[PDB]
Design a protein around this ligand. Structure first.
Ligand SMILES: [Cl-]
Ligand SMILES: [Cl-]
Ligand SMILES: [Zn+2]
Ligand SMILES: [Zn+2]
Ligand SMILES: [Zn+2]
Ligand SMILES: [Zn+2]
Ligand SMILES: [Zn+2]
Ligand SMILES: [Zn+2]
Lengths: 268, 274
Protein backbone atom coordinates (compact mmCIF):
# COMPACT_ATOMS: atom_id res chain seq x y z
CA UNK A 1 0.00 0.00 0.00
CA UNK A 2 2.68 2.54 1.05
CA UNK A 3 5.68 2.97 -1.20
CA UNK A 4 7.98 5.93 -1.02
CA UNK A 5 10.21 7.41 -3.65
CA UNK A 6 12.80 9.65 -1.95
CA UNK A 7 15.25 12.16 -3.46
CA UNK A 8 18.35 13.33 -1.59
CA UNK A 9 19.98 10.11 -0.30
CA UNK A 10 23.40 11.78 0.13
CA UNK A 11 21.58 14.32 2.31
CA UNK A 12 20.73 14.75 5.96
CA UNK A 13 16.93 14.60 5.76
CA UNK A 14 17.13 12.03 2.91
CA UNK A 15 19.20 9.54 4.91
CA UNK A 16 17.17 10.00 8.12
CA UNK A 17 14.02 9.34 6.08
CA UNK A 18 15.51 6.03 4.93
CA UNK A 19 16.26 4.89 8.49
CA UNK A 20 12.80 6.13 9.50
CA UNK A 21 11.29 4.00 6.75
CA UNK A 22 13.06 0.89 8.01
CA UNK A 23 11.94 1.11 11.64
CA UNK A 24 8.43 2.02 10.48
CA UNK A 25 8.52 -0.97 8.11
CA UNK A 26 7.58 1.11 5.06
CA UNK A 27 8.70 0.18 1.54
CA UNK A 28 10.99 2.91 0.18
CA UNK A 29 13.55 3.53 -2.58
CA UNK A 30 16.02 6.35 -3.20
CA UNK A 31 15.46 8.08 -6.56
CA UNK A 32 18.27 7.02 -8.86
CA UNK A 33 17.49 9.83 -11.27
CA UNK A 34 18.52 13.47 -11.31
CA UNK A 35 16.17 16.40 -10.66
CA UNK A 36 17.85 18.36 -13.46
CA UNK A 37 16.15 16.08 -16.06
CA UNK A 38 12.54 14.99 -16.53
CA UNK A 39 13.51 11.74 -18.29
CA UNK A 40 15.14 10.34 -15.16
CA UNK A 41 12.24 11.17 -12.91
CA UNK A 42 9.55 9.65 -15.13
CA UNK A 43 11.64 6.48 -15.26
CA UNK A 44 12.06 6.24 -11.47
CA UNK A 45 8.32 6.71 -10.98
CA UNK A 46 7.31 4.16 -13.61
CA UNK A 47 9.93 1.70 -12.28
CA UNK A 48 9.23 2.15 -8.57
CA UNK A 49 5.50 2.84 -8.82
CA UNK A 50 5.49 4.95 -5.61
CA UNK A 51 2.35 6.11 -3.77
CA UNK A 52 4.10 9.14 -2.39
CA UNK A 53 7.25 11.08 -3.27
CA UNK A 54 9.63 12.94 -0.94
CA UNK A 55 11.91 15.80 -1.94
CA UNK A 56 14.88 16.26 0.32
CA UNK A 57 17.27 17.22 -2.48
CA UNK A 58 19.07 20.46 -1.67
CA UNK A 59 19.82 21.97 1.78
CA UNK A 60 27.29 32.68 -3.92
CA UNK A 61 29.26 33.06 -7.16
CA UNK A 62 27.62 32.61 -10.61
CA UNK A 63 28.61 28.96 -11.03
CA UNK A 64 27.12 28.03 -7.68
CA UNK A 65 24.00 30.17 -8.14
CA UNK A 66 23.41 28.57 -11.57
CA UNK A 67 23.95 25.11 -9.99
CA UNK A 68 21.39 25.90 -7.26
CA UNK A 69 18.87 27.14 -9.80
CA UNK A 70 19.28 23.88 -11.76
CA UNK A 71 18.38 21.76 -8.72
CA UNK A 72 16.27 23.96 -6.46
CA UNK A 73 14.27 25.64 -9.15
CA UNK A 74 14.18 23.79 -12.49
CA UNK A 75 14.58 20.39 -10.87
CA UNK A 76 12.10 20.93 -8.06
CA UNK A 77 9.52 22.37 -10.47
CA UNK A 78 10.00 19.44 -12.86
CA UNK A 79 9.51 16.79 -10.13
CA UNK A 80 6.49 18.70 -8.89
CA UNK A 81 5.03 18.73 -12.43
CA UNK A 82 5.57 15.01 -13.08
CA UNK A 83 4.21 14.08 -9.63
CA UNK A 84 1.17 16.19 -10.43
CA UNK A 85 0.63 14.61 -13.85
CA UNK A 86 0.84 11.24 -12.04
CA UNK A 87 -1.44 12.14 -9.11
CA UNK A 88 1.36 11.75 -6.54
CA UNK A 89 1.55 13.76 -3.33
CA UNK A 90 5.00 15.42 -3.27
CA UNK A 91 6.44 16.19 0.18
CA UNK A 92 8.73 19.13 -0.45
CA UNK A 93 11.32 19.88 2.26
CA UNK A 94 11.98 23.59 2.19
CA UNK A 95 12.92 26.57 4.40
CA UNK A 96 11.35 29.04 6.81
CA UNK A 97 14.38 31.30 6.66
CA UNK A 98 12.66 33.60 4.18
CA UNK A 99 10.99 35.63 6.89
CA UNK A 100 12.38 38.06 9.48
CA UNK A 101 11.03 40.02 12.46
CA UNK A 102 9.29 43.23 11.39
CA UNK A 103 6.87 46.06 12.32
CA UNK A 104 3.94 43.63 12.10
CA UNK A 105 5.69 40.67 13.75
CA UNK A 106 8.18 42.25 16.12
CA UNK A 107 11.02 40.52 17.89
CA UNK A 108 9.59 39.21 21.13
CA UNK A 109 5.92 39.53 20.22
CA UNK A 110 4.53 36.00 19.97
CA UNK A 111 3.05 36.93 16.60
CA UNK A 112 4.53 34.54 14.08
CA UNK A 113 4.52 34.56 10.32
CA UNK A 114 1.72 32.49 8.81
CA UNK A 115 1.74 30.07 5.90
CA UNK A 116 -0.29 32.56 3.88
CA UNK A 117 2.21 35.37 4.44
CA UNK A 118 4.41 37.06 1.92
CA UNK A 119 8.12 36.22 2.51
CA UNK A 120 9.65 39.42 3.81
CA UNK A 121 13.31 38.38 3.76
CA UNK A 122 14.42 38.04 0.16
CA UNK A 123 17.59 40.06 -0.25
CA UNK A 124 20.01 37.13 -0.25
CA UNK A 125 19.99 35.01 -3.44
CA UNK A 126 19.28 31.80 -1.54
CA UNK A 127 16.40 33.51 0.24
CA UNK A 128 14.90 35.01 -2.87
CA UNK A 129 15.23 31.83 -4.91
CA UNK A 130 13.64 29.82 -2.12
CA UNK A 131 10.78 32.33 -1.94
CA UNK A 132 10.31 32.18 -5.74
CA UNK A 133 9.99 28.37 -5.76
CA UNK A 134 7.62 28.32 -2.78
CA UNK A 135 5.39 30.90 -4.49
CA UNK A 136 5.37 28.91 -7.74
CA UNK A 137 4.71 25.56 -5.96
CA UNK A 138 1.37 26.90 -4.67
CA UNK A 139 -0.15 26.17 -8.09
CA UNK A 140 0.53 22.45 -7.61
CA UNK A 141 -2.39 21.00 -5.64
CA UNK A 142 -0.43 17.80 -4.89
CA UNK A 143 2.65 19.44 -3.44
CA UNK A 144 3.08 19.82 0.32
CA UNK A 145 5.81 22.33 1.19
CA UNK A 146 7.47 22.24 4.61
CA UNK A 147 9.15 25.36 6.10
CA UNK A 148 12.10 23.83 7.95
CA UNK A 149 14.33 26.16 9.99
CA UNK A 150 17.72 25.60 11.67
CA UNK A 151 17.30 21.81 11.79
CA UNK A 152 18.46 20.05 14.92
CA UNK A 153 18.65 16.30 15.57
CA UNK A 154 19.68 13.87 18.34
CA UNK A 155 23.14 13.38 16.81
CA UNK A 156 25.54 16.16 17.80
CA UNK A 157 28.41 14.82 15.69
CA UNK A 158 26.63 16.19 12.62
CA UNK A 159 28.32 19.44 11.55
CA UNK A 160 24.96 20.48 10.00
CA UNK A 161 23.11 20.25 13.36
CA UNK A 162 22.34 23.76 14.63
CA UNK A 163 23.32 23.02 18.21
CA UNK A 164 26.84 22.01 17.23
CA UNK A 165 27.22 25.16 15.11
CA UNK A 166 26.28 27.44 18.02
CA UNK A 167 28.52 25.53 20.49
CA UNK A 168 31.47 26.34 18.23
CA UNK A 169 30.98 30.06 17.53
CA UNK A 170 33.47 32.41 19.21
CA UNK A 171 30.84 34.92 20.25
CA UNK A 172 27.13 34.24 19.74
CA UNK A 173 24.08 36.50 19.48
CA UNK A 174 20.95 35.91 21.56
CA UNK A 175 17.77 36.02 19.48
CA UNK A 176 14.69 33.79 19.86
CA UNK A 177 14.02 31.66 16.70
CA UNK A 178 11.61 28.99 15.47
CA UNK A 179 13.51 25.72 14.86
CA UNK A 180 12.89 22.15 13.64
CA UNK A 181 13.56 19.22 15.97
CA UNK A 182 14.07 16.55 13.27
CA UNK A 183 13.56 13.42 15.43
CA UNK A 184 10.01 14.60 16.15
CA UNK A 185 8.99 16.48 12.96
CA UNK A 186 10.30 13.98 10.36
CA UNK A 187 7.99 11.18 11.56
CA UNK A 188 5.29 13.85 11.45
CA UNK A 189 6.10 14.71 7.81
CA UNK A 190 5.75 11.02 6.84
CA UNK A 191 2.32 11.09 8.49
CA UNK A 192 1.48 14.10 6.37
CA UNK A 193 2.02 12.07 3.21
CA UNK A 194 -0.23 9.26 4.55
CA UNK A 195 -2.97 11.80 5.24
CA UNK A 196 -2.32 13.41 1.81
CA UNK A 197 -1.80 16.87 3.26
CA UNK A 198 -0.92 19.57 0.73
CA UNK A 199 -0.31 23.34 0.70
CA UNK A 200 2.32 25.09 2.83
CA UNK A 201 3.06 24.22 6.45
CA UNK A 202 5.42 26.09 8.71
CA UNK A 203 7.51 23.15 9.89
CA UNK A 204 9.15 24.28 13.13
CA UNK A 205 8.15 23.35 16.67
CA UNK A 206 5.86 25.94 18.34
CA UNK A 207 7.48 28.61 20.51
CA UNK A 208 10.97 30.06 20.07
CA UNK A 209 14.46 29.43 21.46
CA UNK A 210 17.58 31.53 21.67
CA UNK A 211 21.23 30.55 21.47
CA UNK A 212 21.73 31.25 25.19
CA UNK A 213 18.87 28.94 26.08
CA UNK A 214 20.29 26.23 23.84
CA UNK A 215 23.81 26.71 25.12
CA UNK A 216 22.46 26.49 28.71
CA UNK A 217 20.85 23.12 27.95
CA UNK A 218 24.12 22.18 26.24
CA UNK A 219 26.30 23.00 29.29
CA UNK A 220 24.01 21.31 31.83
CA UNK A 221 23.25 18.19 29.80
CA UNK A 222 26.32 17.43 27.68
CA UNK A 223 29.40 19.41 28.90
CA UNK A 224 29.24 20.98 32.40
CA UNK A 225 32.47 22.86 31.72
CA UNK A 226 31.23 24.62 28.55
CA UNK A 227 31.55 28.42 28.25
CA UNK A 228 30.50 31.05 25.70
CA UNK A 229 30.69 34.81 25.02
CA UNK A 230 27.96 37.14 23.79
CA UNK A 231 28.09 40.08 21.39
CA UNK A 232 28.13 43.22 23.61
CA UNK A 233 22.81 38.88 7.36
CA UNK A 234 20.87 35.86 8.61
CA UNK A 235 17.16 35.16 9.11
CA UNK A 236 15.53 35.60 12.54
CA UNK A 237 11.85 34.97 13.15
CA UNK A 238 8.98 33.04 14.60
CA UNK A 239 6.81 30.86 12.41
CA UNK A 240 3.21 30.41 13.55
CA UNK A 241 2.63 26.78 14.55
CA UNK A 242 -1.20 26.89 14.47
CA UNK A 243 -1.82 25.10 11.18
CA UNK A 244 0.68 22.29 11.85
CA UNK A 245 -0.52 22.06 15.47
CA UNK A 246 -4.19 21.70 14.50
CA UNK A 247 -3.31 18.69 12.36
CA UNK A 248 -0.92 17.29 14.98
CA UNK A 249 -1.85 18.06 18.61
CA UNK A 250 0.90 15.71 19.86
CA UNK A 251 3.53 18.13 18.54
CA UNK A 252 5.85 19.49 21.23
CA UNK A 253 7.25 22.96 21.88
CA UNK A 254 11.00 23.44 21.22
CA UNK A 255 12.42 23.45 24.75
CA UNK A 256 10.25 20.53 25.80
CA UNK A 257 11.17 18.79 22.50
CA UNK A 258 14.86 19.68 22.77
CA UNK A 259 14.79 18.07 26.25
CA UNK A 260 13.17 14.77 25.21
CA UNK A 261 14.59 14.07 21.74
CA UNK A 262 17.98 15.69 21.98
CA UNK A 263 19.37 16.45 25.45
CA UNK A 264 18.18 13.59 27.66
CA UNK A 265 19.47 10.96 25.28
CA UNK A 266 22.85 12.70 25.00
CA UNK A 267 23.24 13.25 28.75
CA UNK A 268 26.71 12.73 30.20
CA UNK B 1 30.19 31.52 -39.85
CA UNK B 2 26.72 31.74 -38.26
CA UNK B 3 24.21 28.96 -37.48
CA UNK B 4 21.12 29.67 -35.42
CA UNK B 5 19.14 27.31 -33.27
CA UNK B 6 15.65 28.78 -32.83
CA UNK B 7 12.92 27.70 -30.42
CA UNK B 8 9.25 28.36 -31.19
CA UNK B 9 8.46 27.83 -34.90
CA UNK B 10 4.84 27.60 -33.78
CA UNK B 11 4.81 31.23 -32.63
CA UNK B 12 4.78 34.75 -34.05
CA UNK B 13 8.38 35.91 -33.48
CA UNK B 14 9.92 32.44 -33.94
CA UNK B 15 8.21 32.18 -37.30
CA UNK B 16 9.37 35.68 -38.25
CA UNK B 17 12.94 34.91 -37.20
CA UNK B 18 13.13 31.87 -39.48
CA UNK B 19 12.04 34.00 -42.41
CA UNK B 20 14.72 36.59 -41.65
CA UNK B 21 17.46 33.97 -41.59
CA UNK B 22 16.19 32.81 -44.99
CA UNK B 23 16.22 36.35 -46.33
CA UNK B 24 19.71 37.06 -44.95
CA UNK B 25 21.23 33.73 -45.97
CA UNK B 26 21.77 32.50 -42.41
CA UNK B 27 21.68 28.79 -41.68
CA UNK B 28 19.03 28.25 -39.00
CA UNK B 29 17.15 25.31 -37.54
CA UNK B 30 14.03 25.04 -35.37
CA UNK B 31 14.56 22.92 -32.26
CA UNK B 32 12.77 19.58 -32.11
CA UNK B 33 13.50 19.38 -28.40
CA UNK B 34 11.01 20.15 -25.66
CA UNK B 35 12.47 22.46 -22.99
CA UNK B 36 13.70 17.84 -21.04
CA UNK B 37 17.45 18.62 -21.00
CA UNK B 38 18.47 15.61 -23.04
CA UNK B 39 15.99 16.73 -25.74
CA UNK B 40 17.72 20.14 -25.86
CA UNK B 41 21.22 18.68 -25.37
CA UNK B 42 20.52 16.59 -28.49
CA UNK B 43 19.55 19.62 -30.57
CA UNK B 44 22.77 21.44 -29.66
CA UNK B 45 24.90 18.49 -30.76
CA UNK B 46 22.82 17.79 -33.87
CA UNK B 47 22.76 21.46 -35.03
CA UNK B 48 26.12 22.55 -33.61
CA UNK B 49 24.70 26.11 -33.48
CA UNK B 50 26.77 29.26 -33.12
CA UNK B 51 23.93 31.02 -31.25
CA UNK B 52 20.48 30.07 -29.83
CA UNK B 53 17.16 31.95 -29.92
CA UNK B 54 14.36 31.39 -27.44
CA UNK B 55 11.04 32.54 -28.87
CA UNK B 56 9.27 29.60 -27.18
CA UNK B 57 6.66 32.06 -26.14
CA UNK B 58 4.61 33.86 -25.78
CA UNK B 59 4.49 36.59 -28.38
CA UNK B 60 2.59 39.40 -26.61
CA UNK B 61 -0.44 39.35 -24.27
CA UNK B 62 -1.29 35.77 -23.28
CA UNK B 63 -4.01 35.11 -23.20
CA UNK B 64 -6.23 32.48 -21.58
CA UNK B 65 -7.61 31.69 -18.14
CA UNK B 66 -5.24 31.31 -15.19
CA UNK B 67 -6.38 28.05 -13.69
CA UNK B 68 -3.94 25.57 -12.20
CA UNK B 69 -3.45 23.53 -15.40
CA UNK B 70 -2.72 26.76 -17.27
CA UNK B 71 -0.46 28.30 -14.65
CA UNK B 72 1.46 25.02 -14.37
CA UNK B 73 1.74 24.87 -18.13
CA UNK B 74 3.54 28.22 -18.23
CA UNK B 75 5.79 27.23 -15.33
CA UNK B 76 6.96 24.11 -17.14
CA UNK B 77 7.88 25.95 -20.33
CA UNK B 78 8.58 29.58 -19.32
CA UNK B 79 10.25 28.81 -16.02
CA UNK B 80 11.77 25.30 -15.94
CA UNK B 81 12.25 25.02 -19.67
CA UNK B 82 13.75 28.50 -20.16
CA UNK B 83 16.01 28.02 -17.15
CA UNK B 84 17.04 24.55 -18.47
CA UNK B 85 17.79 26.06 -21.89
CA UNK B 86 19.84 28.91 -20.38
CA UNK B 87 21.83 26.39 -18.34
CA UNK B 88 22.78 24.13 -21.22
CA UNK B 89 23.72 27.14 -23.35
CA UNK B 90 25.84 28.56 -20.52
CA UNK B 91 27.69 25.28 -20.02
CA UNK B 92 28.36 25.17 -23.78
CA UNK B 93 29.48 28.80 -24.05
CA UNK B 94 26.47 29.52 -26.28
CA UNK B 95 24.77 32.94 -26.37
CA UNK B 96 21.03 32.72 -25.90
CA UNK B 97 18.72 35.45 -27.16
CA UNK B 98 15.72 35.31 -24.85
CA UNK B 99 12.61 37.15 -26.10
CA UNK B 100 10.61 38.23 -23.06
CA UNK B 101 8.29 40.92 -21.73
CA UNK B 102 8.36 44.53 -20.63
CA UNK B 103 4.80 44.26 -19.37
CA UNK B 104 6.10 43.72 -15.87
CA UNK B 105 6.40 47.41 -15.12
CA UNK B 106 3.77 50.05 -14.34
CA UNK B 107 3.47 53.87 -14.21
CA UNK B 108 4.34 54.97 -10.65
CA UNK B 109 5.39 57.89 -8.39
CA UNK B 110 8.93 57.78 -9.80
CA UNK B 111 7.95 57.04 -13.39
CA UNK B 112 4.62 58.87 -13.78
CA UNK B 113 2.23 58.75 -16.72
CA UNK B 114 3.27 61.52 -19.12
CA UNK B 115 6.65 62.25 -17.51
CA UNK B 116 8.81 60.82 -20.27
CA UNK B 117 10.65 59.01 -17.47
CA UNK B 118 10.96 55.35 -18.45
CA UNK B 119 11.87 52.20 -16.56
CA UNK B 120 15.42 50.98 -16.86
CA UNK B 121 16.94 47.53 -17.31
CA UNK B 122 18.26 47.66 -13.74
CA UNK B 123 14.87 48.67 -12.35
CA UNK B 124 12.91 46.25 -10.24
CA UNK B 125 9.63 45.09 -11.82
CA UNK B 126 6.83 46.90 -10.04
CA UNK B 127 3.79 45.33 -11.72
CA UNK B 128 3.51 41.81 -10.38
CA UNK B 129 0.03 41.36 -8.99
CA UNK B 130 -1.05 38.90 -11.68
CA UNK B 131 0.43 35.40 -12.08
CA UNK B 132 1.83 35.88 -15.56
CA UNK B 133 3.49 39.12 -14.45
CA UNK B 134 5.04 37.77 -11.26
CA UNK B 135 6.26 34.69 -13.12
CA UNK B 136 7.98 36.49 -15.99
CA UNK B 137 9.64 38.81 -13.46
CA UNK B 138 10.94 35.74 -11.52
CA UNK B 139 12.50 34.16 -14.63
CA UNK B 140 13.94 37.49 -15.71
CA UNK B 141 15.53 38.01 -12.31
CA UNK B 142 16.93 34.46 -12.38
CA UNK B 143 18.30 34.86 -15.90
CA UNK B 144 20.47 37.71 -14.52
CA UNK B 145 22.69 34.93 -13.13
CA UNK B 146 23.37 33.48 -16.62
CA UNK B 147 26.03 35.72 -18.18
CA UNK B 148 25.44 34.21 -21.63
CA UNK B 149 21.76 35.13 -21.81
CA UNK B 150 20.42 38.27 -23.46
CA UNK B 151 16.91 39.05 -22.18
CA UNK B 152 14.82 41.30 -24.43
CA UNK B 153 11.79 43.14 -23.02
CA UNK B 154 9.24 43.14 -25.87
CA UNK B 155 5.99 45.10 -25.34
CA UNK B 156 2.78 45.06 -27.44
CA UNK B 157 4.49 43.57 -30.53
CA UNK B 158 3.48 45.08 -33.92
CA UNK B 159 3.94 44.01 -37.54
CA UNK B 160 3.53 45.23 -41.11
CA UNK B 161 1.23 42.19 -41.42
CA UNK B 162 -2.10 43.73 -40.37
CA UNK B 163 -3.95 40.43 -40.88
CA UNK B 164 -2.30 38.79 -37.89
CA UNK B 165 -4.61 38.70 -34.83
CA UNK B 166 -1.57 38.83 -32.52
CA UNK B 167 -0.63 42.23 -33.95
CA UNK B 168 -1.41 44.91 -31.37
CA UNK B 169 -2.71 47.28 -34.04
CA UNK B 170 -5.29 44.87 -35.46
CA UNK B 171 -6.45 43.94 -31.94
CA UNK B 172 -7.14 47.60 -31.16
CA UNK B 173 -8.50 48.29 -34.66
CA UNK B 174 -10.93 45.39 -34.21
CA UNK B 175 -12.19 46.53 -30.83
CA UNK B 176 -15.26 48.65 -30.08
CA UNK B 177 -13.94 51.08 -27.49
CA UNK B 178 -10.31 51.44 -26.41
CA UNK B 179 -8.45 52.80 -23.41
CA UNK B 180 -6.07 55.42 -24.83
CA UNK B 181 -2.87 55.17 -22.74
CA UNK B 182 0.60 56.18 -24.02
CA UNK B 183 2.74 53.02 -24.02
CA UNK B 184 6.17 51.77 -25.10
CA UNK B 185 5.78 49.35 -28.02
CA UNK B 186 7.89 47.08 -30.19
CA UNK B 187 7.97 47.29 -34.00
CA UNK B 188 8.92 43.69 -34.86
CA UNK B 189 9.78 44.56 -38.48
CA UNK B 190 12.50 46.96 -37.32
CA UNK B 191 13.45 45.36 -33.99
CA UNK B 192 13.63 41.68 -34.96
CA UNK B 193 16.44 42.29 -37.42
CA UNK B 194 18.34 44.18 -34.67
CA UNK B 195 17.99 41.17 -32.38
CA UNK B 196 19.78 39.04 -34.99
CA UNK B 197 22.57 41.66 -34.78
CA UNK B 198 22.71 41.55 -30.96
CA UNK B 199 23.43 37.84 -31.22
CA UNK B 200 26.13 38.53 -33.81
CA UNK B 201 27.70 41.01 -31.35
CA UNK B 202 27.41 38.55 -28.48
CA UNK B 203 25.33 40.99 -26.37
CA UNK B 204 24.18 39.95 -22.87
CA UNK B 205 22.22 41.16 -19.85
CA UNK B 206 18.85 42.88 -20.04
CA UNK B 207 17.73 45.19 -22.86
CA UNK B 208 14.52 47.16 -22.96
CA UNK B 209 13.41 46.19 -26.47
CA UNK B 210 10.70 48.64 -27.50
CA UNK B 211 11.15 51.59 -29.83
CA UNK B 212 12.08 54.91 -28.21
CA UNK B 213 9.09 57.03 -27.13
CA UNK B 214 5.41 56.23 -26.53
CA UNK B 215 2.15 56.00 -28.55
CA UNK B 216 -1.39 56.01 -27.23
CA UNK B 217 -4.08 53.76 -28.73
CA UNK B 218 -5.65 56.82 -30.29
CA UNK B 219 -2.52 58.11 -32.01
CA UNK B 220 -2.40 54.66 -33.55
CA UNK B 221 -6.05 54.41 -34.61
CA UNK B 222 -5.75 57.84 -36.25
CA UNK B 223 -2.85 56.48 -38.30
CA UNK B 224 -4.92 53.41 -39.10
CA UNK B 225 -7.67 55.71 -40.35
CA UNK B 226 -5.61 57.98 -42.57
CA UNK B 227 -3.49 55.21 -43.98
CA UNK B 228 -5.67 52.15 -44.36
CA UNK B 229 -9.35 52.95 -43.82
CA UNK B 230 -10.52 56.62 -43.87
CA UNK B 231 -14.01 55.37 -43.03
CA UNK B 232 -12.76 53.94 -39.71
CA UNK B 233 -14.47 54.73 -36.38
CA UNK B 234 -13.88 54.19 -32.66
CA UNK B 235 -15.08 55.35 -29.22
CA UNK B 236 -13.30 55.58 -25.86
CA UNK B 237 -13.91 54.75 -22.19
CA UNK B 238 -15.13 57.55 -19.90
CA UNK B 239 -14.71 54.50 -16.15
CA UNK B 240 -5.66 45.46 -15.20
CA UNK B 241 -3.28 45.81 -18.20
CA UNK B 242 0.36 46.91 -17.92
CA UNK B 243 0.92 50.54 -18.84
CA UNK B 244 4.43 51.98 -18.94
CA UNK B 245 7.29 53.67 -20.74
CA UNK B 246 10.60 51.75 -21.11
CA UNK B 247 13.87 53.71 -21.25
CA UNK B 248 15.48 53.07 -24.65
CA UNK B 249 18.86 54.66 -23.88
CA UNK B 250 20.75 51.37 -23.67
CA UNK B 251 19.35 49.98 -26.97
CA UNK B 252 19.82 53.33 -28.78
CA UNK B 253 23.41 53.69 -27.63
CA UNK B 254 24.11 50.27 -29.14
CA UNK B 255 21.90 50.98 -32.20
CA UNK B 256 21.90 54.72 -33.24
CA UNK B 257 19.78 53.92 -36.29
CA UNK B 258 16.91 52.84 -33.97
CA UNK B 259 13.79 54.89 -34.79
CA UNK B 260 11.02 56.09 -32.48
CA UNK B 261 7.59 54.46 -32.56
CA UNK B 262 5.81 57.11 -34.56
CA UNK B 263 8.42 57.31 -37.31
CA UNK B 264 8.96 53.53 -37.10
CA UNK B 265 5.20 52.95 -37.31
CA UNK B 266 4.99 55.22 -40.39
CA UNK B 267 7.97 53.74 -42.19
CA UNK B 268 7.58 50.04 -41.39
CA UNK B 269 3.89 49.56 -40.85
CA UNK B 270 1.58 52.19 -42.36
CA UNK B 271 3.34 53.52 -45.52
CA UNK B 272 3.92 50.10 -47.10
CA UNK B 273 0.25 49.36 -46.48
CA UNK B 274 -1.45 52.36 -48.17
CL1 LIG C 1 0.84 40.09 7.34
CL1 LIG D 1 13.69 52.54 -10.12
ZN1 LIG E 1 30.83 29.90 -5.17
ZN1 LIG F 1 18.64 29.09 7.72
ZN1 LIG G 1 1.41 37.55 9.57
ZN1 LIG H 1 2.10 42.63 -23.75
ZN1 LIG I 1 13.81 54.32 -13.16
ZN1 LIG J 1 31.26 32.29 -16.20
Amino acid sequence: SFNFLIYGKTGWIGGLLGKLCEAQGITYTYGSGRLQDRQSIVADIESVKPSHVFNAAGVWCESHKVETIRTNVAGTLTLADICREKGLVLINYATGCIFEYDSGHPLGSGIGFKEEDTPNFTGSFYSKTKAMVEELLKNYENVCTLRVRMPISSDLTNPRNFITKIARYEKVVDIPNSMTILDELLPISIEMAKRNLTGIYNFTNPGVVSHNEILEMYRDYIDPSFTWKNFTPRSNNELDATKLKTEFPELMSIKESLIKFVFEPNKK
